[PDB]
Design a protein around this ligand. Structure first.
Ligand SMILES: [Ca+2]
Ligand SMILES: [Ca+2]
Ligand SMILES: [Ca+2]
Ligand SMILES: [Ca+2]
Ligand SMILES: [Ca+2]
Ligand SMILES: [Ca+2]
Ligand SMILES: [Ca+2]
Ligand SMILES: [Ca+2]
Lengths: 114, 114, 114, 114
């Protein structure tokens, strides 16, 4: 299945935060309605935050996360979870090698804000 | 139900990150096997990160999040989600008032690291 | 927090299924836009299905689960999870006594159908 | 990523329930520790239950779901969610064709029982 794609409500503010856990330098691209609106880059084997931003989901509400290491696409896993019928998490893990920890870059998207 | 309590694997490294979305100043306490091992305080209505740390789950693996505003306990909601049978997220929302957005402090715990 | 309340897309077919794991006879009440549309009753300590129905979410899309045993309200826990940005589960556990297993009646709501 | 594989606690009773939403006859295979312990075969475009069984997770706790239609593997998606730090759902969707609804066979694994 396609992974890392989420439909948000339209024109809604959301937070996107990325953590790194790999020897490889991670590149996280955030696309909103098929336009790149953020790129995070960093390296950590200790969960360092390599980016955190507030973005808007725009008309289509389509938010896609892509992760690469040195231009090679990582394999993704994802889900969305909603708590108390209001608090949304869109969760992505990525795998840049063979160990299947899926934590090489971890991306957490949350809404609503404010 | 009790919320904000999670059983991790023993002696395991995990990340904890807290976000704020309220007029009220948020205090997030992190307890590992009933000892307070981190405390984050901060105020934001725009999802600012008010703390991020790497901790060890210790022998019991018990991780509890408590949130308060002005010394008053916030109501919590929580769940744990596992992706690819390996990547774990323990998720907490908290409500300090009456609107029920449960985002006033948002806490994300992730493991494994490295 | 209020639990057992979910917002579905409007005018959408959904499935609701209830399982029992208790000595007590479970009564599961299903409301759609604040009107009772189903009631499932049954007893099992071995996960027997006590009801499965297809319903429509109507204009408001509001679905609520309540659980009681001999007229006494059970404590609820719930969450919604979305897979592949399309497959939805709305999940309820309920606790009729003291052991905190939350499985006394378990309710799974799924959409889309067809 | 591999999907439809879950680690349960050892020697634990669990329920497995399959729903069908396709024109195609669905064959759901359940393995516990790499041995077939159940096979559900049925057809429905309206969420009918094509199998429900109680099984034991055995020493390894490994549970795998595979879905096929006329001998051809469906694409799977999955996740595990834990409520109240005790109530577990392991969730599978499967796609037998092109529409990406992932509901053609839907598998819900729950524990604990009793
Ligand atoms: Ca890896
Ligand atoms: Ca890693
Ligand atoms: Ca609030
Ligand atoms: Ca708020
Ligand atoms: Ca109970
Ligand atoms: Ca029970
Ligand atoms: Ca399909
Ligand atoms: Ca279908």
């Amino acid at each position: 299945a396609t992974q890392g794609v989420f439909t948000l409500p339209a024109n809604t503010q959301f937070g996107v935060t990325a953590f790194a856990n790999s020897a490889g330098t991670q590149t996280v691209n955030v696309q909103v309605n098929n336009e790149t609106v953020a790129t995070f880059t960093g390296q950590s084997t200790n969960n360092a935050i390599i980016g955190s931003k507030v973005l808007n989901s725009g008309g289509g509400g389509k938010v896609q996360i892509l992760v690469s290491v040195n231009g090679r696409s990582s394999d993704l896993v994802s889900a969305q979870v909603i708590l108390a019928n209001e608090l949304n998490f869109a969760l992505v893990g990525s795998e840049d090698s063979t160990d299947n920890d899926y934590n090489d870059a971890v991306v957490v998207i949350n809404w609503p804000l404010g």
